[PDB]
Design a protein around this ligand. Structure first.
Ligand SMILES: O=C(O)c1cc(=O)[nH]c(=O)n1[C@@H]1O[C@H](COP(=O)(O)O)[C@@H](O)[C@H]1O
Ligand SMILES: O=C(O)c1cc(=O)[nH]c(=O)n1[C@@H]1O[C@H](COP(=O)(O)O)[C@@H](O)[C@H]1O
Lengths: 256, 256
């Protein structure tokens, strides 16, 4: 198994993946903050304070009450300053012709500011084809949702295998997965795992949690995605540090 | 088989479904216009001119370049005047906690103006639970995506059966399906079918077309969803009439 820094140099690495892997090793972080807030001011204060601790900030632009493109200008400034990628967790899941417009246009202009987006594989490979027609020219990357954290997920068995095949057949654009585990044996592909908290539990609406040690160390994923475990804590900086240290040591101990 | 008007009176009918079925029979239309445009003025001019011909107007609010809530105020005026429902084709597909915010909040406030939304079933039933916590109090309905029109769709076999079960277990909120065919044997559930054109063909990004006669008459669906077959035509009113008459006669001939 190669280090993040060595993976960043793999022949077939995507440029977005390489940038990410380099800053993960430089900063000793494999934590993605899920900035699940409705106020721009809170999003930006979290991005600034937690920026040094994270490799990535995941957004849901469609829950921000006071979205403007200028908010995203301010977010990019912070991402550049603190060195993290922006991942819009849009979960594109329509026909190719529709998702291209959803990605490029409308109010959000997601492709203009998001390094990464993700997509469901259920519509077939046209979802990726449509996105890639916007995202390739804009030097973006995409993650495919191969497994989900929620109770009753149907992203298992042959579905997960189809996501892996689709990623591998569109490596020009697809840089990895949302998954609960390592699903691809090719080290050029990132594995990002949500449903992460230090303590056992879940929410009232089907979320299920596993620890950083479980998903990075035992299940072989690369990056933890953490929302409420950080966001709901009083001191979100120390919470982010706890999660960072957990995920980083789990990664180190798997490299041996 | 019962008429749309009789289905509107079924004991277990949802109020949104009943409203829809009543206006379908009153107006002799089972056509849903897919208003896949980027300008508010065009959306509203289409809604006004085509309103008499349609039972429903399907939106992708996230491709509208000049979205405001006032545009949607103007759309509701037209929907009330001409008697059609508004369906936001958002394809919610996240954990329950996330989709509740995506449905109620952000810039779009979808639940405030959309009679209907839809969801993928891949995350498990928490997606429906989350939506229903916003949509039940707001007297809304939801469609579950049981089959898709696109090449390579994984919404087949056990996946489609899971969508049907999920709908049937959440009949307080779920009023039907996006599907290619009748998938539920319970007449209280609407079947809406996209991927419809009069002529054979497809697009460059995995869309596949079948005719109104095929999907309403042979496959037993209720409503056709038509975008480019109308939107790209020169005379969109006559195109809508062609599709309306096709879908309506196919429905009549299946009732015998
Ligand atoms: O794509 C995601 O990030 C995602 C996929 C998945 O399987 N599960 C999942 O929880 N997520 C997202 O990751 C975040 C989890 O947040 P918490 O449960 O608060 O840690 C939310 O923003 C979800 O939308
Ligand atoms: O949910 C939908 O309406 C949908 C589901 C599906 O399986 N296929 C499908 O095409 N759609 C949508 O229906 C419309 C089809 O448009 P046309 O291909 O232009 O008729 C688009 O807005 C798609 O996003």
């Amino acid at each position: 198994e190669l280090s993040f820094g060595a993976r960043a140099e793999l022949p077939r690495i995507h440029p977005v993946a390489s940038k990410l892997l380099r800053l993960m090793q430089k900063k000793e972080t494999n934590l993605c903050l899920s900035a699940d807030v409705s106020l721009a001011r809170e999003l930006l204060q979290l991005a600034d304070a937690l920026g040094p601790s994270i490799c990535m900030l995941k957004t849901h632009v469609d829950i921000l009450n006071d979205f403007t493109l200028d908010v995203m200008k301010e977010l990019i400034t912070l991402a550049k300053c603190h060195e993290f990628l922006i991942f819009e967790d849009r979960k594109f899941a329509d026909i190719g012709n529709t998702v291209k417009k959803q990605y490029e246009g409308g109010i959000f202009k997601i492709a203009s500011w998001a390094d990464l987006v993700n997509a469901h594989v259920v519509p077939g490979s046209g979802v990726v084809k449509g996105l890639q027609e916007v995202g390739l020219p804009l030097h973006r990357g995409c993650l495919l949702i191969a497994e989900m954290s929620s109770t009753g997920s149907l992203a298992t068995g042959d579905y997960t295998r189809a996501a892996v095949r689709m990623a591998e057949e569109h490596s020009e654009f697809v840089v990895g997965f949302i998954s609960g585990s390592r699903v691809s044996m090719k080290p050029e592909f990132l594995h990002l795992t949500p449903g992460v908290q230090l303590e056992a539990g879940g929410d009232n609406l089907g979320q299920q949690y596993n620890s950083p040690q479980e998903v990075i160390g035992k299940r072989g994923s690369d990056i933890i995605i953490v929302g409420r475990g950080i966001i709901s804590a009083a001191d979100r900086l120390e919470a982010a540090e706890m999660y960072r240290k957990a995920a980083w040591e789990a990664y180190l101990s798997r490299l041996g």
